[PDB]
Design a protein around this ligand. Structure first.
Ligand SMILES: Nc1ncnc2c1ncn2[C@@H]1O[C@H](COP(=O)(O)OP(=O)(O)OP(=O)(O)O)[C@@H](O)[C@H]1O
Length: 248
């Protein structure tokens, strides 16, 4: 037998043995790894998510086993895609965390077992500090992966076989990855530099993958193109960058 507590402890120490008798348990009781009872009743955290927090050296194979179990009952999709429900981390999925942790291997794994690449992490933890904070990138995996300057994962999100990212999706505020990048600028020289070329990179990928899309024309919920946001919020280095590119 297994209660929520039993597994969460097993996960905490990366124990793949105490979960030997796992699969056969919810075969008898036909319980699901996704049942109400197997989540924290106030956050919506699952064992996979506990595993995501309890990393040791960016590794945990309780994950690999946990996923494996979910397919055998085919809890698979809704398991890998369960989100936080507390006001703080609301809408955060395991894929968000893998990226937050800069972990290709776990991004790769989650996407292959069908992580939703468009899932919006929209809780107060993913918007501007109360101050609380903090920190906004907004919302969507691609946006995250860019705003944290993680090119390879930006590429893997957009290019993968399993679910390519929608490069033009808008977060709750209307912002696309180009909008979010403008928001993440802070007018320091190294800041400009990284935003500026990640921006460049996104456009190069837009034009390579989906040529019809006029990315820089897309307005956030306040009617602002990325450029116009840049200028509304005194993000000058980037403003200068965006206009200089249009000039060629
Ligand atoms: N996206 C995140 N990034 C960084 N830290 C996070 C994130 N989400 C949650 N945390 C931190 O990890 C903690 C949860 O860690 P863990 O999953 O080990 O929970 P616990 O409360 O120690 O154990 P249990 O869930 O078994 O009671 C949260 O309280 C929070 O401080």
């Amino acid at each position: 037998l297994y209660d929520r507590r039993s597994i969460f402890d097993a996960v905490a120490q990366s124990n793949c043995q105490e979960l030997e008798s796992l699969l056969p348990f919810l075969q008898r009781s036909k319980k699901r790894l996704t049942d109400s009872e197997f989540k924290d009743p106030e956050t919506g955290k699952t064992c996979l998510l506990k595993a995501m927090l309890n990393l040791h050296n960016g590794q945990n194979d309780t994950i690999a086993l946990l996923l494996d179990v979910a397919r055998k009952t085919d809890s698979l999709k809704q398991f890998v895609n369960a989100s936080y429900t507390d006001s703080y981390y609301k809408g955060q999925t395991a894929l968000h965390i893998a990226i937050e942790r800069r972990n290709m291997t776990l991004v790769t794994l989650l996407v292959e077992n069908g992580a939703d690449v468009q899932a919006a992490a929209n809780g107060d933890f993913f918007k501007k500090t109360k101050g609380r904070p903090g920190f906004y990138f907004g919302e969507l995996p691609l946006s995250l992966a860019a705003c944290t300057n993680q090119l390879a994962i930006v590429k893997f999100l957009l290019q993968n076989s399993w679910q390519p990212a929608d490069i033009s999706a808008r977060d709750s505020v209307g912002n696309t990855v180009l909008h979010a990048l403008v928001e993440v600028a802070d007018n320091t020289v190294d800041n400009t530099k990284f935003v500026t070329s990640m921006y460049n990179e996104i456009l190069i990928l837009g034009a390579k993958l989906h040529p019809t899309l006029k990315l820089e024309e897309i307005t956030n919920r306040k009617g602002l193109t990325p450029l116009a946001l840049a200028a509304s919020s005194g993000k000058i280095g980037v403003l200068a960058y965006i206009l200089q590119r249009e000039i060629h």
